[PDB]
């Protein structure tokens with residue numbers, strides 16, 4: 001029976017370019033949302049997003065290799081290097097074969113897709129870059145990291161839209177627990193703040209259009225919420241078999257004890273009022289970890305700030321938590337960070353792990369006036385200290401009705 | 412210890428719109444390659460591909476739901492309905508929660524990506540379809556099928572480029588074997604025969620440009636080969652826990668006994684001369700199934716028809732097979748079908764299963780003059796009868812150096 005622990009963290013987010021700076025900003029209630037200035041937003045209903053500030057990879061990726069990568073890949077590689085360095089793991093000929101990666105994205109390389117298509121429209125196919133395919137496809141972050149570190153173990157990339165982060169991390173764990181690997185770098189990366197991303201989620205009526213107050217736009221469970229806020233970034237964890245971790249004297253952030261999956265089988269872009277899929281995913285993670293809902297002290301919600309989605313998850317938590325629903329803390333960091341899509345569940349799993357280490361839960365900012373009829377504690381406005389918290393639960397849900405939940409355990 | 416069997420098959424390919432018609436064409440050595448006529452190829456170095464002929468979904472998808480889906484999704488849904496019907500499984504309230512899907516794609520919705528981007532360039536973001544995101548993203552085939560059949564179990568989508576088919580099928584099996592599900596519809600779908608797909612793989616110098624003889628273009632291991640041939644389609648299998656299958660009187664095509672993964676950690680778009688990654692993936696599948704290379708009677712190769720790729724896999728087979736290398740049969744159906752990318756490993760896993768049922772192996776057509784120095788039997792030109800074949804092995808490799816191998820066992 002192989003246990004899986006977390007021994008390395010890496011991250012780029014709209015509120016910090018490292019794991020610790022991001023976590024600190026979150027506990028301080030800082031918003032990373034701002035007006036977009038990299039493309040003309042005049043014709044766009046939504047003109048703001050959670051952008052990665054002053055992104056720097058000069059020292060990690062040549063400007064030469066950079067030409068072959070969409071920004072999402074650059075972000076994922078930087079976050080993965082952060083996590084690999086953080087873990088302190090040394091790759092050897094003996095080891096190589098037992099270390100792999102499970103890294104995905106929800107939409108992949110929109111920026112270079114648009115650049116190559118513009119080139120084709122303007123000058124014909126001869127203007128398409130030789131790097132079109134490898135610079136835009138989802139699995140390219142795992143591709144570059146394995147090459148960079150000489151990892152020859154299993155490499156997969158799960159693209160389950162907004163649930164990708166959670167699924168890649170959960171399957172990395174399954175892979176290790178099954179015996180196919182002893183270490184996996186896992187998570188997700190996304191850079192969808194482009195004309196097609198903003199225009200596309202906007203065409204669907206899914207984004208907040210509160211342009212006059214971008215930082216107040218993301219407000220999960222608030223009565224005035226009007227859609228999600230796009231966020232860019234990457235989150236990466238180094239997962240590792242327990243005995244392997246101890247043997248090398250690794251620092252252990254927490255243990256990954258449960259992973260649950262489910263499907264809504266309801267609608268392509270909306271959950272059922274019931275939240276029955278979200279509930280099933282949580283129920284499965286609890287069963288997988290062998291614990292009762294009452295043992296969870298904090299739920300890092302999917303909480304995207306949409307009218308129907310927030311309501312469904314609140315119903316799901318009430319259903320799974322029952323009596324303890326008032327005792328469990330629930331918050332949505334998307335209130336500050338925006339929605340990282342395929343990387344959401346990866347950065348949020350990190351927040352869930354840090355909550356265990358620091359015994360402190362970040363708030364749902366902007367929660368001025370919560371929906372009526374709900375007795376859940378969404379940790380409005382300010383961080384909250386916790387006492388003897390042993391388990392946290394991270395949810396991620398996605399278009400296509402695909403859901404996932406992870407459960408982390410202290411020590 | 413839960414065993415996984417295959418109880419349903421579905422498929423659309425350039426040589427047939429059903430599983431049986433496709434298999435028959437393959438055993439007859441028929442090419443499905445033709446000149447492209449749906450877009451003007453004047454400026455294109457490659458002007459042919461393996462197209463799905465007379466695709467029909469009128470009776471499976473309304474022309475209304477169709478408007479919300481890229482062709483790859485339409486293909487995957489039709490193949491998945493074929494597999495679900497073939498399995499004879501009945502979905503109940505009791506069952507729903509235990510049936511899921513693992514379906515992916517390598518590039519996803521290129522056609523609608525291009526249509527929406529053209530619309531944005533011509534008329535601004537207001538012209539982007541509300542269906543842009545859900546009509547192009549990778550996980551949408553699993554999304555629609557779960558909704559269509561009321562499946563509430565685990566749903567994932569692996570996007571590992573040209574290895575997707577094999578990885579989705581292997582992880583569907585892991586999911587069932589772990590206990591997270593009793594049935595999974597799994598496979599891949601692709602429709603990359605578009606300006607960006609043909610122009611994009613063409614910019615990379617990876618496609619054959621033998622326009623004067625499209626049907627002779629795909630010629631794995633042949634001295635005159637000059638790159639892969641793009642193919643469109645979908646392959647889907649219904650995987651199911653053994654006891655669950657027997658209990659309902661399911662028809663069982665074969666058993667899935669081994670799944671191996673590996674990474675080349677070499678180059679983003681080319682394997683090492685050594686084929687050491689391909690070898691490791693095969694070695695891992697053999698270990699997973701608990702058998703020796705000598706027990707395999709047929710290898711459905713990745714064999715894409717590129718100068719470097721074919722050579723590497725031939726080296727890998729020689730390495731893993733050793734003495735038995737001359738005794739094992741190896742063929743590449745891409746010689747006829749073209750390269751289905753994310754769906755390649757899914758359709759090829761089907762070919763691998765049918766080879767067991769019929770005791771017949773399809774040929775590598777166009778193999779007029781094999782590379783020198785290789786003593787492998789690539790089954791040139793004509794199908795071959797086999798005698799007491801108990802195991803087949805299917806390989807799929809992809810950009811990013813990601814590899815996978817599956818092993819199927821008779822009965």
Ligand SMILES: C[C@]12C[C@]34C[C@H]1C[C@H](O2)[C@H]3[C@](C)(CCC(=O)Nc1c(O)ccc(C(=O)O)c1O)C(=O)C[C@@H]4c1ccccc1
Pocket residue numbers: 162204205206207227228268269270271304306307308309310339397398399400401
């Ligand atoms: C067809 C509609 C209905 C519509 C507008 C479009 C878009 C969406 O479907 C829906 C939204 C905006 C979003 C529902 C939702 O939360 N989907 C969802 C999800 O299922 C999984 C993950 C995520 C994520 O962001 O990771 C996510 O957003 C809503 O609130 C009600 C509203 C709506 C408007 C007017 C009348 C009725 C309903």
Ligand SMILES: C[C@]12C[C@]34C[C@H]1C[C@H](O2)[C@H]3[C@](C)(CCC(=O)Nc1c(O)ccc(C(=O)O)c1O)C(=O)C[C@@H]4c1ccccc1
Pocket residue numbers: 573615616617618638639679680681682715717718719720721750808809810811812
């Ligand atoms: C940088 C280059 C080198 C180049 C041209 C570009 C494209 C590619 O890389 C390579 C090709 C065309 C393809 C190598 C390959 O098989 N990649 C591959 C793979 O790693 C996994 C899966 C698949 C699949 O199709 O599923 C696949 O194609 C070759 O043969 C030699 C040739 C080349 C030309 C001139 C000099 C040296 C080399």
